[PDB]
Design a protein around this ligand. Structure first.
Ligand SMILES: C[S@@+](CC[C@H](N)C(=O)[O-])C[C@H]1O[C@@H](n2cnc3c(N)ncnc32)[C@H](O)[C@@H]1O
Ligand SMILES: C[S@@+](CC[C@H](N)C(=O)[O-])C[C@H]1O[C@@H](n2cnc3c(N)ncnc32)[C@H](O)[C@@H]1O
Ligand SMILES: COc1ccc(C[C@H]2c3cc(O)c(OC)cc3CCN2C)cc1O
Ligand SMILES: COc1ccc(C[C@H]2c3cc(O)c(OC)cc3CCN2C)cc1O
Lengths: 339, 339
C-alpha cells in the first residue's frame, strides 16, 4: 500500500497488525543502512567527516502524567537503554544494572559532587544519592514535572543529598563546578555539540570526569528524518526534525575542550529488550493507561493517538536496535577529562 | 615446508619463486586479520582501547649508498606510499602527485615556515621549497647521509630556502615554532606517541597546523611482529621489534595537546603500486645494484643478503597493502591544530 497518508490512516485504526508493522519499519531501517555504508573506507571517512563538519557549522506544554509513565516504564521510569544480563531479566533489574554500569564506568566514588544533565525522572540521580550518601547529586532538567517528581521521590526515600536545577542546559550559566558530570542519552537532542561540550568543560576542574552515553550507529552518523517519501515512520515519531544519531566514534572529533580517556559500546540488543519491555508493559496495562490519559487529553481518540505514537516508537525501536543481532544501532559511551 | 630456518634457508638461496613467496606472505597477513577482527563492535572497541592504553604506558652505522637508493626508488627517492592516478602512472609521477596531495591537505601556502619530521631523502622538503619560494622549509632527520643528500640537491636545484636539522626527534629541544609541521610515515617508528604529539605541540603556535600520514589498518592496531612460529616474515623484515601499525582512527585518542580538524584515508592499492614499482626497478637494475653495494659490503653474499631483504620487503608489502583490493592495510592522514 503506497502513500504516507494511507499507511498513517490504517495505523491509527489499529488495522495494521504487529507483524506487518515490524516488517515495514525494518525495511525503512534497511534503506538507511544502504544510505550510510560506503564501498571503501576512503569514502566512508569522507562521508563521516562531512557530517561532522556540518555539525560544527550549526549555531510543547503537554507532558504525560507520571501515573501513565509508571504504567509503561520500569520502576524508576528510566527512559534510556537498560542492561539485560539474562533472558528473564526484568525491566526493573535491567534499570538497576545499567545504573551500576554508569557508576562503574564514570568512576563514581563516595564524597564527589555529581551533575546529571537531562536527568529525566531522576532514576540515576536517586541511585547515586542512595548508594553514596556523602555524594551531593544535582539533576538538571528543562521539565518542571520532572523536577517535582524527583524531589518527591527523594523525600520518600529519605535522601538529603539531592537537588534539581530547572533549566534549558543550552542557556544555563553558572560558576559551579562538579567532580562528575553524566550525560545519559541527552546528546541526541543537542543542536550545537561543540558548544555543548565547551560549556560542560567550564563546569569541570582538572580532577573532574565527564561520562556520556548516546544512541549511535556503529559506522555512520545520521539525522533521524525521512530519506524518501516511502518513510512515514521518522516524521511520525519525531515530528520536529531535530534528533541526530551520531556514529559510535563521532564524539572523538569533539575534543576541543575535553580529552577522551575511555570509550565503549553496548550491543543494541540491550536497547531492543528495553523498548520491548516497555511495549509489553504498556500492552498489559492498556485499559488503565487509557483511563489515566483521558482527563488531560479530552477525547478517547486523542488518547488512542498518544498510545499509538508510543507503541509504534517501541515497535520501531525494536526493529532498529535488534538489526543484525544488535550490531548496527547501539549505545556508545565515552569518558573524558577537561583539556 | 615447516621450520623458520628451513624457509629462511631456501629464501636466501633464491630457491623460492615469486608465486610461492607471495602466497606464503599473504597467508601470514590473513592470520593477522583473524587476530585483529572481533565478532562484535563491543569487543572490537575493547581490543582497540586496550592497545591504545598500552601505548600510553610506554616510556646501525650501515646506511645504503645513495646510488643504490637511486637505482631502486623513484627520482626523489621517496620512501613512503605514492599516489597513482592511472595504470600507467610511473613512480616518478606518483611521487609528485603524493607531494601535491600533502601540500593541498596540509594547506601549505607561500610564505609559511614548514618543518618536515623524518624527512628521509627530502623529496617533500625540495618540492615545497621549489614550489613556494617564500616558504622557509626545514627537514629534520637522524641520518647524516640524508642531511648531506638533501643539502646537495638543494644546491643543485638552486634552492636558497632549505635547511636540515640533524637530530633524534625524541631528544631534540628547541624554542623555534613553525606554521606547518609534516610527519610523513614516521609515526610507525615512534615509541612514545603521547610524548611525540606533546613535543610537536610545543613547536606550534595558535595559527599552526600539523599534518600526519601513517601506514594503518582500517579497523585495528598491531605491532609489526610475529603472531606465531609460522611467521618467518615479520622478524626477517624488522629484526628490531619496534614498528607499530596504528588503526586508521588510533590518533583520535591522542588529542591531549592537538585537536583534529580533518581525517582521510588513502586506499592501500596506492602503497601496493608503490612497492611494486620499487621491486620492478630494483629487478631491472639488479646487476648495477650488486656492483654498487659490493664495496661497502665486502662479499657477494652480503650483497645478496641486503638485496633479498629489500626485495622480500617489497613482495610482502605488495601482499599486505593489496589485500582485499586495498581495503585492509592503507594510509591514514590527519590534520590538527594546537589545543
Ligand atoms: C532520552 S531522555 C534521557 C533521560 C534520563 N537521562 C534517562 O536516562 O532516563 C533525555 C532528557 O533530556 C531532556 N532535555 C532535552 N533537551 C534538554 C535541554 N536543552 N535542557 C535540559 N534537558 C533537556 C529531556 O527533557 C529528557 O528528559
Ligand atoms: C619511512 S621513512 C619516511 C621518509 C620520508 N618522510 C618520506 O616520505 O620518504 C621514515 C624516516 O624517519 C626517520 N626517523 C626514524 N626515527 C627517527 C627519529 N627518532 N628522529 C628522526 N628521524 C627519525 C628515518 O631515518 C626515516 O628516514
Ligand atoms: C518521548 O520521549 C522519549 C524519548 C526516548 C525514549 C527511549 C530511548 C530512545 C529509544 C529509541 O529507539 C530512540 O530512537 C532512535 C530514541 C530514544 C531516546 C533515548 N532513550 C531514552 C523514551 C521516551 O519516552
Ligand atoms: C628500510 O626502510 C624503509 C622503510 C619503509 C619503506 C617504505 C614504506 C613502507 C612500506 C611497508 O610495506 C611497510 O610495512 C608495513 C612499512 C613502510 C615504512 C614507511 N614507508 C616509507 C622503505 C624503506 O626503505
Amino acid at each position: 500500500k503506497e502513500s504516507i497518508g494511507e499507511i498513517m490512516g490504517k495505523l491509527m485504526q489499529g488495522e495494521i497488525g504487529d507483524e506487518e508493522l515490524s516488517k515495514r519499519i525494518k525495511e525503512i531501517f534497511g534503506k538507511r543502512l544502504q544510505w550510510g555504508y560506503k564501498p571503501t573506507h576512503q569514502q566512508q571517512l569522507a562521508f563521516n567527516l562531512d557530517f561532522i563538519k556540518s555539525l560544527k557549522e550549526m549555531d510543547e506544554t503537554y507532558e504525560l502524567p507520571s501515573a501513565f509513565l509508571e504504567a509503561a516504564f520500569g520502576k524508576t521510569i528510566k527512559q534510556s537503554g537498560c542492561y539485560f544480563k539474562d533472558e528473564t531479566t526484568t525491566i526493573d533489574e535491567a534499570e538497576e544494572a545499567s545504573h551500576e554500569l554508569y557508576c562503574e564506568r564514570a568512576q563514581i566514588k563516595d564524597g564527589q559532587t555529581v551533575l546529571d544533565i537531562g536527568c529525566g525522572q531522576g532514576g540515576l540521580v536517586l541511585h547515586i544519592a542512595q548508594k553514596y550518601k556523602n555524594c551531593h547529586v544535582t539533576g538538571l532538567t528543562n521539565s518542571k514535572a520532572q523536577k517535582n517528581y524527583i524531589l518527591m521521590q527523594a523525600e520518600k526515600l529519605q535522601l538529603s543529598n539531592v537537588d534539581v536545577i530547572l533549566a534549558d542546559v543550552t542557556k544555563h550559566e553558572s560558576d559551579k563546578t562538579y567532580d562528575r558530570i553524566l550525560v545519559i542519552e541527552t546528546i541526541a537532542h543537542m543542536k550545537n555539540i561543540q558548544l555543548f561540550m565547551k560549556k560542560l568543560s567550564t563546569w569541570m576542574t582538572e580532577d573532574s570526569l565527564l561520562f556520556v552515553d548516546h544512541i549511535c550507529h556503529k559506522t555512520f552518523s545520521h539525522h533521524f528524518e525521512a530519506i524518501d517519501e516511502d518513510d512515514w515512520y521518522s516524521g511520525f515519531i519525531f515530528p520536529k526534525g531535530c534528533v541526530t544519531i551520531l556514529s559510535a566514534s563521532a564524539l572523538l572529533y569533539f575534543q576541543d575542550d575535553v580529552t577522551i580517556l575511555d570509550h565503549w559500546v553496548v550491543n543494541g540488543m540491550h536497547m531492543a529488550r528495553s523498548v520491548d519491555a516497555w511495549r509489553k508493559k504498556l500492552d498489559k496495562n492498556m485499559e488503565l493507561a487509557r483511563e489515566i490519559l483521558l482527563p488531560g487529553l479530552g477525547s478517547k481518540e486523542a488518547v488512542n493517538g498518544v498510545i499509538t505514537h508510543i507503541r509504534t516508537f517501541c515497535m520501531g525501536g525494536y526493529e532498529q536496535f535488534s538489526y543484525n543481532n544488535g550490531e548496527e544501532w547501539m549505545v556508545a559511551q565515552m569518558l573524558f577529562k577537561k583539556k
